[PDB]
Structure formats: C-alpha cells, structure tokens
Amino acid sequence: MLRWITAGESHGRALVAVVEGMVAGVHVTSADIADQLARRRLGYGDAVTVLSGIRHGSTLGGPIAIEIGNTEWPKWETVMAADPVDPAELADVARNAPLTRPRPGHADYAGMLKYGFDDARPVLERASARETAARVAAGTVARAFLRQALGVEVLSHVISIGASAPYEGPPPRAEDLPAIDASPVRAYDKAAEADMIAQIEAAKKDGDTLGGVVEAVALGLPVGLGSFTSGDHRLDSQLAAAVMGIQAIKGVEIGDGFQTARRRGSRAHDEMYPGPDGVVRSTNRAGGLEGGMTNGQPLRVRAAMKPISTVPRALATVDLATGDEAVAIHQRSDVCAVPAAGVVVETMVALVLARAALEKFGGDSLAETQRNIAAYQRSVADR
Amino acid sequence: MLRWITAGESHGRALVAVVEGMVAGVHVTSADIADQLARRRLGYGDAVTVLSGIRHGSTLGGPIAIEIGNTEWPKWETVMAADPVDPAELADVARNAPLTRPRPGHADYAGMLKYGFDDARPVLERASARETAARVAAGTVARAFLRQALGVEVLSHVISIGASAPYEGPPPRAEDLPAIDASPVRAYDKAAEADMIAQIEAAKKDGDTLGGVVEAVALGLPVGLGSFTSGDHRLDSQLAAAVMGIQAIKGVEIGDGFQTARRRGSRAHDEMYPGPDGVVRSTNRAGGLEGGMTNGQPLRVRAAMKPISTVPRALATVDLATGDEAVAIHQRSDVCAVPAAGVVVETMVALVLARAALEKFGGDSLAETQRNIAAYQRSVADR
Ligand code: NA
Ligand code: NA
Ligand code: NA
Ligand code: NA
Ligand code: NA
Ligand code: NA
C-alpha cells in the first residue's frame, strides 16, 4: 500500500519525507520536487536531496527518502541541537528563552498539557506548517505516478479569501494552471482575484490576518477508485482525512458540499445520458464521487482554512508559568497563506488518489500497473 | 488499537458488527444496543444478539461481535441466498429481476463498472444505509466506554433541513437530549423545528426529497486527545474520515468551519483567560479542537447530508444493458433521513474518540485505563 510520512522540526537541520509502496519505473527528479516546493511559496500576502528510492530519474520500488534543508540552521544549531548542550551555555542564549504563553488557535496549549511540556517550543516546532513542505515533496512522487499511469492532473484555485465574494463559476482545466499560478492569489477568475487582493490589502493595513477557501480539482480519473464496501474505503472518507489533517483546515467538502444539503433531490444530483463512448452528464454537483467512488467527472475537493498567522496585541492568553493574564505573540507574519494552502491540498489529494489507484490496479512496476489499467479500461469500454 | 468493522447486505440474513481492542470491564448490554438502534429509527419524514466479547454485561477484552437480524429475510432468502440456487427456479422469481438502471447519486453506476457487475443488486445491497445499523451497534460499545472512563457524552441536533433557516444558537447539553429526541426533526430550537417540519411537508407534497445539516457535540473531553505530530494523528483528520465515510455525507466542519474562513484573525479564535481550575474561554469557534487535539471545550462536528432517497420520475439515467435512455427508480421512500443521520454521526464520533482515548491512556481493563486517566488529570491540575 502506498504510505507517506514526514519528519522534521521547523528550525531543525532538515525535513524528511519518506514514500513507501510506489511502483518502480516512475520518472521523477529532484528538479520536479523543487518545482513543486516553489509552487508552495506562491502568494501575495528548500534545498532538495533525494537520498533513496530513485536511480537515474526512475523510482526503484523501495522507500523514497527526500531531504529538505533548513537554510537558517546555523542560527538554530544550538537551540535545536539534537544532542545535549551545557545548560549554562544555553542559559546565556536569549533565543532559547521559554515560550509559556500559548497562541489561541494553535497547538501550543493542548500540546503542552498532552506531553507535559512547560515550554511551547517542542510543540510549535513540529506543529508548524513548515511540515507541509515535506508533504509536498512526497506528493510530487504521487503526482508523477498519476500523470504517467493514468493521465491524471491535479490542480487548485482559490474560491475566497476573507470576506470576498466566492467564485462560483466553473472549475479550471489543466491548461489554466499557468494563469492561476501567475495570479497573486491563485484565482481562476479576474473579478474574484481583485476582490481577494482588496481583502488582503485591507487586512494588511489593519494589522489583521485572513483565512479562505480553496478547491482542488483532479482531472482524467477512471471510474471506480475507492469503494462502497465500508466507510473507510469510501474515497471521500480518505480525501477528508488527508485534507482535514492539513494545518489550519476546519472544513472539507466534496463537490457542492454544504450547498447540496440545502437542495431538493430533484436538483441535487447529476443525471446520466447516453453518449458515444459511455454515459455522460451535464452537471457535476457530486464533485466526481458517488457512493465513495470516482464516477468519471472532475474530482472537486474544497477546504476551509482559518487564519493561520496570529494577530499582534489582540488575543488574550495565559502565562502558564504564573497563571497570569498575557497577550499572545506571533511566530509568523504573513497576512494570508490561502494560495499556498491550495498547493498543499493538491498534494494530499494526489497522495490519496495514487494510493487508491495502486490498490485497484496493483503492480510492482509502472509498465505492469499500466497494463492492468488498460485492460480494465478495455473491459469497461467493451460493456 | 480500537477497530470496528461492519458486514451485511440490506436484504441479507443479518448484519454483523465486530469491535476489536476494547478494554475488559466496560458495562454494556443487548438492551443498550437496542436502545441506540431505536434512536437510529427516529425522525418525521433490529433484533440484537451479542455473540462474543461480553459476559454478564461486562466486556471481556476480546473481539465483540453483535448480530442484527433482518426481519424480512423470508422474502429475500432465495434472491439473496448465500448458496447456489437453480437458475431455472430463480428465472421464475420476479424479485430477482435485473437492476440495470443506476440511480444518480448512488453507488450503482460506479460500483457496477468497478466490480464488472451487470446488475446493481450486489452494489446497492452493500452500499445501502442499512449498514449504518451495524455502525450504531459498534458505537454503543464506544459510548459506554467514553461515559464510564471519561464521563463523556455524545449527542446531536439538527441544524437545517432543506431550505430551512439554520439554527445558529448555542449547542445543547446532555440534559437536553430527551427534548431533542422527542422532536420530530431532532431540533434543539423550537423555531428551527417548525421551519424544518414545514420544509418536509412541502417536499412531501411535491413528491421530492431533502438533505440537511447536523451537529454532533461531545462533552467532558480531557485536553490532549489526538496529536499535532502528523496529519493522520490530528483528531480532526480522524473525525473527518469517520463522518465523511457515512452514506450521503458531502461535507464535514469542525466548530465554525467554513464561516471561520471568512473571518479575520482578530475574531476567528478562542482567547484564553485565567480561572480557578485552569485556563477558561468565552467562545468555542474552534469546536473543541486546536492543532489536532481536544482543548477542553465541547467538540462540535457538523456534517452535510445530500438527499439520500431518489425522486420518482425526475432523474434521467441510462439502461446499461441497452445504452438507452431511462428514468431512475427509487429503493427508499422517505422524504428526509437527516435526524437519524445525526445519530449515525454521534456513533462515528464516539468510535474515533474512544480509539483516541485508548491510544493515550492505554490499559487492558477499564480500572487500569481509569487509573491512567486520573493520574494524567492530576498531573495537569498540579501545573
Ligand atoms: Na519530527
Ligand atoms: Na516500468
Ligand atoms: Na466540475
Ligand atoms: Na457484507
Ligand atoms: Na475493570
Ligand atoms: Na460550544
């Protein structure tokens, strides 16, 4: 089974992603990884070393380990040293001071209590969204597989930021990605773009921060990934887990999501009609999933992100050392990370889709998986 | 690790739930199970046999197997026979006729293609929401554990059905459950109740069907279930998987969810203040989770359900046998199943919470787990 794991602290030496269970023969390079890491850095308001699992630009079949360096490591090499440091030397280092005032909205408080820590540092170092870089590295392998095996593309666009009027037009196609990635807020629609940029400008002036909604779209999927046989096998379950597990995400929808719940059955679903090469539909309210399976239509997954950067001077907290009232201090200064969150959602979607495809189509090498896919597609067409 | 699995077809002999990894010593009976199954039958518009794992009303520590009979089995005992039946005898049975016209919105089409079936019967039998009965049986064990180990209660109430004005007042407490369960639409609020009942009456008159939004609330949780250490360990990920995997669910939110994404950082989070016995908060926008962990506040999980019963004569489909146009025929006749969906969401929430509690607190018997919980609570209080 395809599996992924990330490791690293925000201010540690490096991050590591390991992907286990990918077939041999998938073409992927350090340059591909770096490119996706560059996309994760997009938005208005990462030295890669492949350590294992890839040879001469082709996966080997074994575990793929990717390291992502921390460029600021020299500043942190004592405070975040793996090995013991003389506590007296450490006592003279201002950077190593105690963080005992948890930020509302973050892991700090619950993580400190959970693990019995008197300092937020060990919590925030691992909880931080810097970890999504390691996710994106892993996701690159999944992306390559999906394209080479299935001709599938995963992209995203931003629906809303702050109080912007949500973009409710049709989703983009793959060929629209260059224009989206060139948008300061990775919007597909120019009117929504302007509205969102205005929201960011206003927040920036007010010294405030914003969240937003993003949509990942996966195109070209075969019918029948996921299953109806149990709750855990439904692809929507799997996608929900992968997307909700992203830092700052507080909601996930498939297709028209919560709006579908307000609609009558007569207008809620996607009717089917005859076509040359199979059943066709004129709507995709379902967002490409029915009964837990891909149905041939674009997969559409939406994620709601809370504002992720803490606001200066606004939020009351408690100094856990004393029990006294305090005010929370920020660790990040960006007004909005929604555009980049879209890229992270793409990654998580790709990983789940790749896993589901390997579950159905099997194989130990790409050529084998491809034969299996072709035979399945033939069997469907011959219906 | 606590694990659950369901088995059964809608018109098979019986359903089975198996729960593995529950501690010995939890008090739970067949009558408790039947009571929760009765709750699953609530809403305006199940013979239980415990086979293993419980002795004299106390769990044994091994796998708990619960069987739920199908009262209509005699009608289906040939059509759904496990063993071969003479195809000629079968050919004279109208009930065994082919279902080759997939219902929009259901598993039928994708499941037929996935598994190479020329009949929807094997798909709809397993995909059907009758399977949620087996979930509720399993969930009863989880509920008992949560109450006995942690004093935790899980309940639900309905937010909206069809185009009703959503209830956005405060959530109920445990002591409100009798009033909610006595409501025809399991609403906490009388004004919202009337609005929802009107929606159902209008749909019923029009020969249409409805979906809706429900909120599960879990009260009394300790701080620090779930973790920030990876995407899969975040409790919101786990809850999202469990809830989105329920039939007909198309969206999941934690706390204020998608609305949080429209708010500024200054008004999006729950500030902390000093209190006698620990940090206190005046808001719960987060819905009881921060950084993937319980934070002490009520857990609030919302689920969006599409309308789940097919509408007579409305939906075009295709006869897969011929390629000809057709109109979809329904398998269920209820206008709205939202109130009951709430009960199923409670179950899935309970199962995930019980699993997370056993992960942190360990133990093989309830008394052992309880000692571990008490010691943790003491250690927190002694901060
Ligand atoms: Na780590
Ligand atoms: Na190959
Ligand atoms: Na679409
Ligand atoms: Na079964
Ligand atoms: Na015990
Ligand atoms: Na609350």
DSSP for residue B171: P
Q: State the nearest Cα–Cα gap between A27 and chain B, in angstroms.
A: 27
CA dihedral B204, B206, B211, B215 (to 10 degrees): -50
Contact between A250 and B266 using a beta-carbon 8 Å cutoff: no
Residue closest to A125 by CA, chosen among A92, A76, A67: A76
**Ligand with the closest atom to the CA of B7:** 4
Q: State the nearest Cα–Cα gap between B56 and chain A, in angstroms.
A: 31
Tokens of B106: 């259901």
- Which of B163, B237, B265 has its CB closest to that of A310? B265
- Which of A241, A260, A316 has its CB closest to that of B238? A241
Query: How close is the Cα of B16 to the center of ligand 4, in Å?
Result: 8
Task: Give the C-alpha separation, B163 to B196, whole Å.
Answer: 8
Q: Which amino acid is at A205?
A: K
Q: Where are the beta strands (DSSP E) in chain B?
A: 3-7, 14-20, 48-52, 54-55, 58-59, 64-69, 153-161, 212-219, 249-254, 289-290, 293-294, 299-305, 316-319, 324-327
Query: How close is the Cα of A173 to the center of ligand 3, in Å?
Result: 9
User: What are the Cα distances from residue B73, in Å, to A277, A309, B68, B171, B359?
Assistant: 40, 58, 12, 41, 40
Resolution of the solved structure (Å): 1.6
State whether the Cα torsion A155-A148-B107-B11 is positive or negative: negative
Q: How many Cβ pairs closer than 8 A exist between chain A and B?
A: 349
Q: Which residues in A lie closer than 8 A to residue B379 (C-beta atoms)?
A: 116
Query: How close is the Cα of B50 to the center of ligand 6, in Å?
Result: 36
Contact between B318 and A273 using a beta-carbon 8 Å cutoff: yes
- Residue B42 CB neighbour total at 10 angstroms: 17
Task: Give the C-alpha separation, A383 to B323, whole Å.
Answer: 10
Task: Give the C-alpha separation, B1 to B4, whole Å.
Answer: 10
Contact between A258 and B306 using a beta-carbon 8 Å cutoff: no
What domains can you pick out in chain B, each with its CATH number? 1-383 (3.60.150.10)
Q: Which residues in A lie closer than 8 A to residue B121 (C-beta atoms)?
A: none
Contact between A253 and B286 using a beta-carbon 8 Å cutoff: no
Residue closest to B219 by CA, chosen among B172, B157, B152: B152
Going by C-beta distance under 8 Å and a sequence separation of 6 or more, which residues neighbour residue B81?
none
Contact between A208 and B265 using a beta-carbon 8 Å cutoff: yes
Tokens of A76: 């942190």
Q: State the nearest Cα–Cα gap between B340 and chain A, in angstroms.
A: 15
Query: How close is the Cα of A145 to the center of ligand 4, in Å?
Result: 32
Q: State the nearest Cα–Cα gap between A312 and chain B, in angstroms.
A: 9
Contact between A360 and B318 using a beta-carbon 8 Å cutoff: no
Apex B84 CA angle, B82 and B85, nearest 5: 110
Task: Give the C-alpha separation, A248 to B292, whole Å.
Answer: 9
**Ligand with the closest atom to the CA of A17:** 1
Is residue B306 part of an annotated ligand binding site? yes
Q: Which residues in A lie closer than 8 A to residue B263 (C-beta atoms)?
A: 211, 306-307
User: What are the Cα distances from residue B311, in Å, to A102, B146, B209, B316, B331?
Assistant: 52, 40, 6, 11, 10
Query: How close is the Cα of A165 to the center of ligand 6, in Å?
Result: 28
Taking ligand 5, which is a single-atom ion, which protein residues have CB atoms under 5 Å away? B 25, 365-367
The β-bridge partners of A294 are A289
Helix (H, G, I), strand (E, B) or coil at B276: coil
Helix (H, G, I), strand (E, B) or coil at A143: helix
- Residue A31 CB neighbour total at 10 angstroms: 9
| Mutate: best of A106, A267, A269, partner B, most B CBs <10 A | A269
Contact between B114 and A293 using a beta-carbon 8 Å cutoff: yes
> Please, is A360 exposed, middle or buried when counting C-beta atoms within 10 Å of its C-beta (0-12, 13-18, 19+)?
middle
Over its C-alpha atoms, chain B yields an Rg (Å, rounded) of 22
Q: Which residues in B lie closer than 8 A to residue A110 (C-beta atoms)?
A: 223-224, 290-291, 293-296
Going by C-beta distance under 8 Å and a sequence separation of 6 or more, which residues neighbour residue B194?
none
Residue closest to B338 by CA, chosen among B232, B203, B235, B170: B203
Is residue B264 part of an annotated ligand binding site? no
User: What are the Cα distances from residue A69, in Å, to A8, A47, A50?
Assistant: 10, 5, 11
